[PDB]
Amino acid sequence: ITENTSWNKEFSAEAVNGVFVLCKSSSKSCATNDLARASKEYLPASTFKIPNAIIGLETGVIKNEHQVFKWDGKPRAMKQWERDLTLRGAIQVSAVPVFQQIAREVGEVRMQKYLKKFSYGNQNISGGIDKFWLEGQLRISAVNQVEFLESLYLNKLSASKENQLIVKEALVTEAAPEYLVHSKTGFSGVGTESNPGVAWWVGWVEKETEVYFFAFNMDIDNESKLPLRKSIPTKIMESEGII
Amino acid sequence: ITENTSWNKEFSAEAVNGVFVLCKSSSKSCATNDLARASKEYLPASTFKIPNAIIGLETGVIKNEHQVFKWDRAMKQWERDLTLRGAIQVSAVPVFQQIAREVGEVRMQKYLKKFSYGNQNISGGIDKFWLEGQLRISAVNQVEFLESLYLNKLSASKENQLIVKEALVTEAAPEYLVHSKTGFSGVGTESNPGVAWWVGWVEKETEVYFFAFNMDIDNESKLPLRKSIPTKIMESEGIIGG
Numbered sequence A: 001i002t003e004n005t006s007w008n009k010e011f012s013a014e015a016v017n018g019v020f021v022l023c024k025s026s027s028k029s030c031a032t033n034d035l036a037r038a039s040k041e042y043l044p045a046s047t048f049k050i051p052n053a054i055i056g057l058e059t060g061v062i063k064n065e066h067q068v069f070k071w072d073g074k075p076r077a078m079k080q081w082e083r084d085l086t087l088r089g090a091i092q093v094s095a096v097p098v099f100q101q102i103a104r105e106v107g108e109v110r111m112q113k114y115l116k117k118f119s120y121g122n123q124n125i126s127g128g129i130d131k132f133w134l135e136g137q138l139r140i141s142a143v144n145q146v147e148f149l150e151s152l153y154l155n156k157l158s159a160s161k162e163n164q165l166i167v168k169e170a171l172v173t174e175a176a177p178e179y180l181v182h183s184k185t186g187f188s189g190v191g192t193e194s195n196p197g198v199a200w201w202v203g204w205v206e207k208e209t210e211v212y213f214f215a216f217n218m219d220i221d222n223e224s225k226l227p228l229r230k231s232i233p234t235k236i237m238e239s240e241g242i243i
Numbered sequence B: 001i002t003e004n005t006s007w008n009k010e011f012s013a014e015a016v017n018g019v020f021v022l023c024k025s026s027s028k029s030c031a032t033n034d035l036a037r038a039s040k041e042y043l044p045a046s047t048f049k050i051p052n053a054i055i056g057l058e059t060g061v062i063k064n065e066h067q068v069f070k071w072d073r074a075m076k077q078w079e080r081d082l083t084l085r086g087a088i089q090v091s092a093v094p095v096f097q098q099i100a101r102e103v104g105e106v107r108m109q110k111y112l113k114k115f116s117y118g119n120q121n122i123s124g125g126i127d128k129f130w131l132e133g134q135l136r137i138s139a140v141n142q143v144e145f146l147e148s149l150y151l152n153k154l155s156a157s158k159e160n161q162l163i164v165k166e167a168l169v170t171e172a173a174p175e176y177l178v179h180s181k182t183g184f185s186g187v188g189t190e191s192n193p194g195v196a197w198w199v200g201w202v203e204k205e206t207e208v209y210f211f212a213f214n215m216d217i218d219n220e221s222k223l224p225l226r227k228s229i230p231t232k233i234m235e236s237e238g239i240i241g242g
């Protein structure tokens, strides 16, 4: 891992405390704006839908790629979650309640087992089975997100290749003939000024025959600043020629 | 399958002869502008990249999803390195000719039988039967084949069906996902037109729509109608837009 000092230009303008980790081809060739923060561990928030989806499929909690998660007609925290959702839909709109129920059906024992298998952060799922990723003790770093996503990319997670392929298609966010982005956002809340929340954007880009793995997180105490989780990384990647 | 003749104005407006088949949920609920043309069989041309890629993977000719097809051509297109997805989505004639040759006639025939793929006639040369040979497939049959692929019901590993499906993703939004494939045999004349295709499926919210379009093409300028006619019909049906 190398430090790229020029990438802090993007951070300084908004007064953002954050890290971007960008790896070309594999996780052996990574660069970052902040070496210290690259392996600092933060709540995963909705980025945990990735492992959770794979585990749901692996355990049979989620039947297959075409399972519909039906809305019961009761109030949800976001209006965009108040509807029937596919697995991809639930991931893409970050429908928390769908994955809370998946996590419950998975259960603590199976959840612990798979996070050990995936080497997923501090592997600490205390804080409640339906909230450990958002309010609990689970922490993961940008470096670890890249390692995990690389494994997913190569189908090297301890899960079926079928199930890894399913979750991979659910993560597509940008598609062109020779350009494909898989990605996922995360946002833990605004916390306080003294103890800010965290915002994430993680994933990988396939450009022509090259692949780039990325993970961004930042402290956030103001919800207005949220779009910087995609705009900072995008600006960095565009400056490096990643279309 | 029901006929919806009100769609014909989208074809006549551009002075083209063609067919659109659109199915909500499954191939038991289809509609088309022209029942006769919906079951007529045409050269698959570049829509054959779907079955050819699946068969390539099934036989081991294509190693996996991360295989790179390296260039060792009168198209700039065919002098680039391509992923499997890249090769499916761009012009890559040498790649697919070579895949077909390595598969060979016996295995190719067997898989097209298993897939119920058109007239199943692979005469005309092992590396050209889908483009200038005897192979023909209807718009209805394309929808049935694509529905099978969607459901992982083709006679092929689920893994390989999933690989080829992600390579066909062409549009992505949180609750809108399009898997699609163009086809084109070349510009013909009025008497002897080429064929152009657009086939695939749209996932909108928790619904899926299977579609297949073809048209006779006798003018290079009319090629983009392969997407715009289907798009206009899907707009009118409420699939495109809210």
Ligand code: AUC
Pocket: A045, A046, A047, A048, A049, A050, A052, A096, A099, A100, A133, A134
């Ligand atoms: N899985 C899951 Au989550 C959030 N926030």
Ligand code: AUC
Pocket: B045, B046, B047, B048, B049, B052, B096, B097, B130, B131, B184
């Ligand atoms: N495979 C395949 Au083709 C064209 N045109």
Ligand code: AUC
Pocket: B046, B049, B087, B090, B091, B092, B093, B094, B096, B097, B127, B128, B131
């Ligand atoms: N791409 C592609 Au072909 C042929 N024949």
Ligand code: AUC
Pocket: B105, B106, B107, B109, B110, B122, B123
């Ligand atoms: N089997 C088989 Au045959 C051809 N051509």
